[PDB]
Amino acid sequence: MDAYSTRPLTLSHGSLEHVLLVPTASFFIASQLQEQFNKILPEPTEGFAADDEPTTPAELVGKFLGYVSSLVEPSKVGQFDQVLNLCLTEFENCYLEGNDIHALAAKLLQENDTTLVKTKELIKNYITARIMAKRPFDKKSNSALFRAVGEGNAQLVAIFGGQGNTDDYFEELRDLYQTYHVLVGDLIKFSAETLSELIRTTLDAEKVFTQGLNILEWLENPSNTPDKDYLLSIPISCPLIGVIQLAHYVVTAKLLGFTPGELRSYLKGATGHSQGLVTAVAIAETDSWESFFVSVRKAITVLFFIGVRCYEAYPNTSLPPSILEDSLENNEGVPSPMLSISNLTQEQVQDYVNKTNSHLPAGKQVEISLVNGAKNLVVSGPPQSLYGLNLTLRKAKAPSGLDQSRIPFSERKLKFSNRFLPVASPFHSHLLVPASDLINKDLVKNNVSFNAKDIQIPVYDTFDGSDLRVLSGSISERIVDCIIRLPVKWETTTQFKATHILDFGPGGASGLGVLTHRNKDGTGVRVIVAGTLDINPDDDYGFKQXXXXXXXXXXXXXXXXXXXXXXXXXXXXX
């Protein structure tokens, strides 16, 4: 054949029995919106919708067809259940050669049209078309960049973040659901039902989800998707969050042709962050997709109840405009009860904290929320107070106006960053405890709150990396106080013997995925999940999954080229 639109891609004339049920796709693919969307390309070269890359036609044809296809795995007969397969492999022999479509994605971000949405669609086309009828994801065998931890050449670790630096949340899950219809309708539809139940069951939780938690439709037709605001509030955010990372670990799986066991396998680490730990745990021990399921039920109800209850502590207090203004001028912004005091030191971060509480009543006082990074140091307390710290915080801070230009270090002043984060609640707090213990019980109160010695790999703690298995606390009683009470000291939670780190951190290159990197510069090669974008071989991600003939190696600062010695062919040192 010949996928048109000014760009040609031969489609081996199926010869007769094919070429007949083919043009039925030839003109249907000539879907009116392809010709006028091809006229926006003879000049505005592939303005939009398809065509981008010369071999991208194979996309929509091998997509549109891969959909109006069988419309059920139970073959809608050869019509669209074989005609679709002559081409499927036909595609797997153009510019992919196995290696995985996700990898052929790189062959776009850098080569031709630097487009994201034009590549994301591209994937969905494949993966979906593939699982539509024959060729299901299973073959198990993978390229490389993964043999490593299996041949002893490397070691892998896993991590999961939370309330990561993103005011989107759902903007990831939707753009995760839509992305791969196939590879997650499960966890999705599943967790859907799941949460949809954990409501009527905790009768009282119905007064905390004003915005119907019908996380279902929210995807298909966001037309009535409950705000952008409260879609973030703790109950509802907590769950869907893991859902994401879980969904990924899944895709990470299903893709890789494995099973949650085939993955809890190649590993050794797996350590989440606060709302990200709950994921690590429930992820450690998971075998086939038969066990893998209720396995999720856990995590879900977990974060679920944490949120639901934590929300009943000191929920979203009606923020005062009296401040919204002033705060929005210094540009600190979203007053949010949690702050990121970057570029500085603890104690320093402390001192300030101190003096503030000093005069401040006990209840409104504030703690040093996190300790991720050697500098970074999130803090939190009632929405208010926090800013009141920013007060003294500002005055002392320097406007970034040249001062070193003429002798600094001695008199020169400091530099900051006092912004807040996308987090309705004050995790790890001094007010998120009276309800803490309750969730512990709220756990058992639902025949699933366990996490026994089934601890596959060593899932490091929120405080001091211990296999988390030292019992005497059920874990599902620590994975509570380590969150809604105790700090994180992350640098202390890392102390890994890794070569890489897989972070299904909560959407984009801003959810620990990179921070973890920050702290260390000459060790792992931290790679993340969703998102295909790149940079400069620093923290390669999203595509380092199905990579073939390309291994990660973030040079070690000492090992990598360290002092040496040698002598001359005439006997001389050097």
Side-chain angles (χ1 to χ4, degrees), residues 349-430:
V349 171
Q350 196 66 55
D351 279 294
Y352 298 154
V353 173
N354 287 303
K355 300 173 182 176
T356 325
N357 298 295
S358 308
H359 334 302
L360 273 166
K364 300 182 176 183
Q365 295 183 304
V366 163
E367 166 192 45
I368 179 168
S369 307
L370 308 179
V371 182
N372 25 305
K375 43 196 172 185
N376 304 267
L377 283 144
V378 178
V379 173
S380 180
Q384 305 207 56
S385 65
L386 223 174
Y387 160 59
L389 142 60
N390 283 283
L391 286 177
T392 54
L393 172 63
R394 298 159 83 179
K395 299 185 180 181
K397 178 185 176 184
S400 80
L402 275 182
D403 64 317
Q404 179 186 62
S405 300
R406 302 288 137 167
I407 274 184
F409 286 79
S410 193
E411 306 179 71
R412 182 182 175 193
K413 290 177 193 171
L414 330 170
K415 303 200 175 188
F416 291 51
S417 178
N418 320 171
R419 63 154 183 172
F420 304 137
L421 301 174
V423 180
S425 304
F427 290 19
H428 319 279
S429 77
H430 279 46

Side-chain angles (χ1 to χ4, degrees), residues 225-340:
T225 290
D227 289 310
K228 184 174 186 177
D229 205 52
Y230 273 51
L231 150 66
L232 185 162
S233 84
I234 175 170
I236 291 184
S237 61
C238 302
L240 291 62
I241 205 175
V243 182
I244 319 165
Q245 6 185 53
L246 298 186
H248 289 291
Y249 182 44
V250 173
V251 198
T252 325
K254 284 225 170 191
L255 154 68
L256 204 50
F258 283 13
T259 330
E262 315 257 65
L263 289 186
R264 67 189 173 182
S265 165
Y266 300 64
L267 191 23
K268 176 180 183 174
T271 308
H273 179 53
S274 46
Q275 181 163 297
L277 196 65
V278 167
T279 293
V281 166
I283 273 190
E285 25 78 298
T286 318
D287 196 300
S288 70
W289 297 308
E290 318 291 47
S291 60
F292 167 63
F293 262 171
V294 185
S295 166
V296 189
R297 182 188 179 188
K298 315 178 183 182
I300 300 187
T301 311
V302 181
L303 302 186
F304 174 93
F305 262 77
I306 321 176
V308 185
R309 301 296 167 174
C310 301
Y311 188 89
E312 294 165 287
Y314 184 52
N316 308 169
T317 268
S318 307
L319 169 67
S322 303
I323 289 180
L324 172 51
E325 205 62 60
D326 187 308
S327 63
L328 225 178
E329 269 217 61
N330 178 187
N331 218 188
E332 306 177 305
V334 206
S336 190
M338 207 172 283
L339 131 76
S340 165

